């Protein structure tokens, strides 16, 4: 019971949420139980993903009380007493940028294993098609995947015309939390969606770029930032994925019959999610969120289709490295608050 | 056990412990190897001088010059510094003591984890960390959110910290320091007809800057007060036995920091430097850095450079700013004392890297524990 | 005064717009508010299959005379 | 080629080498280098004339070895 | 006289318009009052005066004009010309009665004063008119920032000069006296061509004399051949306090270097004399009993008379501006 | 072959070299020797005297123009010429000064010293005040020198100075410096340590001038300010000194300031000047020097000409001669004395000491 003194400071640390909960309560367990528990740990990454926390919370809490023979003693006294109020601020949520923006690389990392960018190829048409005001497809093939990720990101051209008729039906896009007070780009560095000025790691950081300031209007009538109040997000609820419907449901029409549709159709959705937060443009429940609801799911599931909404299992490197990053900011503040608890004096 | 604390910046390296409210050995980082076989030829077991005695034989033995700009460049001839620092200076063990680095504003991902590996690799430290020298230099003030002007030899920088994180887009670097100024006013001193050499006939001249040198506030005012008074000037004996004056170029060196045109840069000093890394930086943190700036180093030594630098960013910058400059008399180390105290605090214990997480994650561990 | 260049909206709506080769997006966006009353924060320039940028002149961007750009506007709908 | 003097109000006399072409701003370019005077603080008075910085030494009938005046404008407080 | 009320809306209209636009309109003791208030700066005295005016006497006078007069009721040193003619009318009026309360000798006496106050390069002169006069007290600026300086120092006001350095050089002009480079003007005024100096406003003082002195118009900033003059004058003094006009003499030297100085394109009324009207300037002149009327005229009619034609052609016509460009506006 | 010129004086000594304009060091007439034994690290003489003091107990050879104790005389010309001029005493001629009526066994160890001690190949003794009148161009005349400790009025007929006529007024400088401390204590001032006297000496010697008229301007200070400038003192302090600044010099006007019974400096020179021949009065009384540091406010000049005339047979021309170079006359007195080729001549030869003894300068130095 040594290096457990760090998961206590982190503790008194008043900025714990229930993301920087869980990144530690599993690292002391992992780093103090080693067994019969890698059902535990597979488990809670599915459910930290899933931004179900306090299910979550609820196995910790208990674990901590089955292998309480096993725990160290007075870690529950303040690991609990700490979970009644735990809440998350999605302004000040970067637990999970960094999260997600790692899960964004490594959901980029499964697409080019599957290579077969033909889908990209053959949506070049339902674009076309499907909207008529711009400069027609991609002008060329896609080849690489980078150029995917600008024909998906031209899905944003067809905007406020062919998707306002599927942005209604919608119980939720309504409930937006955004604002019109329209602050402007700021330089930043941390990668995705994370903050501009909250910390990275050395090896995260990806060049300075002039990245938006979006904030949000807390005067909203549950919208996000209060229904969710995990999901860290920039600016809310997507707004081009009722615009990717617009392509993809045709295209899935077209092309319903063939074969792999589902294999060229989580392609898309998947390139979709990831490249939006690891460009910055939104949250995985800001784009997935939108494709939960029930009208969007319609065509999918009528296509017997499913969506895995960029799922995966080995997250472990993602969960990983966000602990650390918890921990690096949680005794950051100890040091600052004895820093400053020692100024004065 | 107690710890080590080493800021290896620019030209000299300032070395001691923790808890320590000095350092106890700032010595160069300079190191001399043989010029030629003949002066290894001799007695030895040893190849290159190190240190403090480097410089005083240098023309038998030639030398180089690592770390000047902040960035380290020879990993070889830095573990020879490092070597001098826990060994044949500031005697105690690396093994049984645990170490703290200062990295320059911006150190590559890369040039850290060879200090990760050299303090592991090859000097057995039972823990250790590397940071910024800023953050330091800020801890120091008592601070943790504020704007840093770290000035050494070779390279100044202004840097914004928001939570003991320098925000990387906004680090400005100026590469010019305290050796473009004791070259300045060695050469406007060598006008005066009070010439010096090029080669350690200068140091004479770094006294002159330290000692009898201040940042004029309005430097027009000042040079007018030079050519109608004889109250400017001040007198400096040199060692060998001459007395000198000075005036003018007392006022002039400094100024390559605020004006630095003088070298024939074409940058900008020091408070256009901070103003532009202020501002690139969003308006909601702006506030609490104009009113928390911390000049560091030992070029921001010099005095009057606080009253300098709030009429010159107070001129710069909104009417509706407070601009606090925090110029501790400790600046000349306080990326030590303040790198003393992180190690002193009781909170550090976790952050050491441990040569535990060393052997098993590798010296890009730095990234993930360090910030 | 010297180049005419017109404003296609989804209506089919041609608007008409006297401007210069220098005038910025910006610009042209705010003659857009002081003819239809859509402020210019709605509105959402294109031409050449791209969303102009604010700070960008007509001659950034190749819109010369008698050129057809495009207006969608925004429902941000708070 | 000739070399002119310029005294100040302290007494104390600068050299400089110039020509019967060289502008008075070359002069007072001269001055800024050889004692850091920013050139606009600079006046430069021969013959109770300020001098010109668009003209020359002979439009002034500066030469031989002349001694030129300079006050410092203090400005800015 | 609906064209004296539709001429106060549109323009950037500021506290020297006001009043003689106003008077202009009224007059269309009470007047030579505000003539004697003009032209000492004291606007806020007036200003309410006169709006107490215009409801001391509403007989006959129109009541769209009390209703807007009253409702309308700044001025920017960088822009404010309705000043600028006044004085540069002052200048030349000051000018004309100095020449017409004439001299003989009183510059020539202080010649003695300026070969030995200051002549460590300076010409030393060696004057049989009033421009030679000028000539002479015009070379006082060759007594610079030396002698000058001691001072210059127990100067309260002079560290508010809101003068900046960037020098942006000489712009050519065919306005005569305190002047603005495109200014309007009459056919009658312009002066043959010159360049004249541009300077600006550094406006990061504090307390600048522009800020707080926001009626007198820019030109330089405050003035400071003046402590030089002073330096010249306490000499003069000196050596003839026991002569029994040199009441008279001082008043002239000092009445025409305001005088030179506002029609050479140098200063305000004010950014000379209100740097002579500080305490210890006059304890020079009030100890040897040489009480400043510092260039205060009786017959002030000439200049005011004109400046509020001036207004008018300017206040009306941004008013046409507006009408052509409402006009062609609507096209 | 360059000659030295050294003024010992009460105060600074002030030395150099025969030739040029000004002297090379001017430092303090003050030796050092410590109190307890934080010696564990010989003598500290001069500024590192003053500097090194809180440990030092300081002995001042020179405070009224006689030499007193000269075990640390011995140390004053040491550092004069091993470490100030950076000279061997040995090798190069010296020109020492001397103060007026001098005892003459107290220039007959400087003699002794020099040839015995430093083995100057030559000397010769001067009177300071010979000196002053020397480098205004005069060879009679009377000198006032006030330098640091002692004021002395001294008659000189064709480069002899008249003992008889000398007299001295032990008000000077070190007198002045510590009134103006005074009367600015009682200002609201304070002025109390020998660092913060320092500064009262740069008030003193830079803002405080002589009037013609002392209740004349006590007048013009109680109804104007124009007399009040500013100080700043280093460590942020502005002060006003108004009528202060005059009230120090002329306590050298009315001894009586002070607490001194004595006569001021322009009634010790009546005295001087008619306790000689009727015939030499003519000729003093138009070649009066003011030389000095303490001669040296402005319009101490002008003063003496106005006190002077009145206490004067009206027909006798005052002339009050104060070159601008008045602090430093004594040594560019010598500086011209000792560069004179006819000069040479008058050096005691070190080796005339040796067989006449010190006893010499009797016979040569006058």
């Not at chain 3, 180049?3 to 857009?32: H, R, W």
């Not at chain 3, 002081?34 to 031409?47: A, H, S, T, V």
């Amino acid at each position: 019971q040594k290096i457990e003194l760090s998961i206590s400071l982190s503790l008194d640390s008043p900025k714990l949420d229930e993301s920087d909960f869980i990144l530690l309560s599993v690292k002391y367990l992992e780093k103090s139980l080693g067994k019969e528990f890698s059902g535990f740990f597979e488990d809670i990454e599915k459910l930290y993903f899933k931004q179900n926390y306090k299910e979550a919370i609820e196995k910790i809490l208990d674990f901590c009380k089955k292998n309480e023979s096993l725990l160290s003693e007075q870690v529950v006294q303040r690991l609990a007493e700490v979970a009644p109020r735990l809440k998350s601020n999605p302004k000040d949520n970067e637990s999970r940028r960094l999260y997600e923006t790692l899960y964004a690389d490594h959901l980029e990392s499964v697409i080019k294993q599957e290579s077969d960018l033909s889908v990209f190829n053959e949506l070049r048409d339902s674009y076309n098609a499907v909207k008529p005001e711009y400069a027609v497809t991609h002008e060329t093939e896609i080849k690489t995947l980078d150029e995917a990720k600008q024909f998906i990101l031209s899905f944003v051209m067809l905007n406020d015309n062919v998707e306002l008729p599927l942005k209604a039906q919608s119980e939720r896009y309504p409930k937006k939390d955004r604002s019109r007070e329209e602050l402007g780009n700021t330089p930043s560095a941390n990668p995705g969606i994370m903050k501009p000025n909250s910390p990275n790691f050395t090896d995260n950081l990806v060049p300075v770029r002039d990245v938006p300031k979006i904030a949000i209007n807390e005067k909203v009538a549950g919208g996000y930032s209060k229904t969710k109040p995990t999901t860290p997000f920039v600016a809310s609820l997507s707004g081009t994925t009722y615009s990717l419907m617009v392509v993809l449901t045709d295209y899935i029409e077209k092309h319903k019959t063939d074969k792999d549709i589902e294999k060229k159709v989580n392609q898309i959705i998947n390139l979709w999610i990831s490249s939006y937060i690891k460009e910055g443009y939104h949250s995985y429940s800001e784009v997935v969120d939108v494709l939960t609801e029930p009208f969007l799911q319609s065509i999918f599931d009528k296509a017997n289709i499913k969506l895995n909404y960029g799922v995966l299992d080995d997250t472990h490197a993602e969960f990983r490295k966000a602990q650390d990053y918890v921990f690096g900011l949680t005794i950051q503040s100890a040091m600052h608050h004895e820093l400053q608890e020692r100024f004065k004096n | 056990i107690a710890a080590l604390v080493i800021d290896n910046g620019s030209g000299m390296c300032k070395a001691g412990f923790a808890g320590d409210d000095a350092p106890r050995a700032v010595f160069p980082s300079i190191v001399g190897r043989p010029r030629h076989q003949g002066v290894m030829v001799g007695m030895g077991q040893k190849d290159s001088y190190v240190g403090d005695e480097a410089q005083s034989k240098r023309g038998i033995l030639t030398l180089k010059y690592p770390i000047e700009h902040g960035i380290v460049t020879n990993w070889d001839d830095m573990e020879k510094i490092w070597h001098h620092t826990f060994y044949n200076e500031l005697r105690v063990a690396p093994e049984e003591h645990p170490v703290l680095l200062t990295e320059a504003p911006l150190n590559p991902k890369a040039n850290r984890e060879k200090m990760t590996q050299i303090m592991f690799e090859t000097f057995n430290t039972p823990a250790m960390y590397v940071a910024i020298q800023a953050v330091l230099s800020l801890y120091a003030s008592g601070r943790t959110t504020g704007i840093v002007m770290d000035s050494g030899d070779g390279v100044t920088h202004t840097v914004p910290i928001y939570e003991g994180y320098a925000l990387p887009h906004a680090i400005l670097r100026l590469d010019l320091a305290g050796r473009d100024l004791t070259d300045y006013l060695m050469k406007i001193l060598t006008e005066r007809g009070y010439s010096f050499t090029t080669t350690a006939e200068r140091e004479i001249v770094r006294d002159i800057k330290e000692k009898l040198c201040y940042v004029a506030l309005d430097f027009e005012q000042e040079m007018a007060t030079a050519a109608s008074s004889s109250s400017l000037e001040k007198s400096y004996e040199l060692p060998d036995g001459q007395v000198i004056t000075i005036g003018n170029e007392r006022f002039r060196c400094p100024e390559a920091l605020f004006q630095p045109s003088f070298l024939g840069m074409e940058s900008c000093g020091i408070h256009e430097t901070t103003f532009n890394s202020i501002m690139k930086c969003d308006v909601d943190i702006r506030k609490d850095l104009y009113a928390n700036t911390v000049l560091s180093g030992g070029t921001t030594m010099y005095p009057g450079i606080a009253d300098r630098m709030q009429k010159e960013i107070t001129a710069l910058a909104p009417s509706t700013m407070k601009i606090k400059i925090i110029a501790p008399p400790e600046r000349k180390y306080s990326v030590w004392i303040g790198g003393s105290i992180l190690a002193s605090l009781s909170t550090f214990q976790q952050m050491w890297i441990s040569k535990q997480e060393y052997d098993e994650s590798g010296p890009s561990i730095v990234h993930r524990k360090c910030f | 005064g010297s180049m005419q260049i017109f404003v296609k909206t989804l209506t089919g709506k041609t608007i008409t717009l006297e401007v210069e080769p220098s005038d910025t997006i910006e610009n042209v966006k705010a003659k857009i508010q002081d003819k239809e009353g859509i402020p210019p924060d709605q509105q959402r320039l294109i031409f050449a299959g791209k969303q102009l940028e604010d700070g960008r002149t007509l001659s950034d961007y190749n819109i010369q005379k008698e050129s057809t750009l495009h207006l969608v506007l925004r429902l941000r709908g708070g």
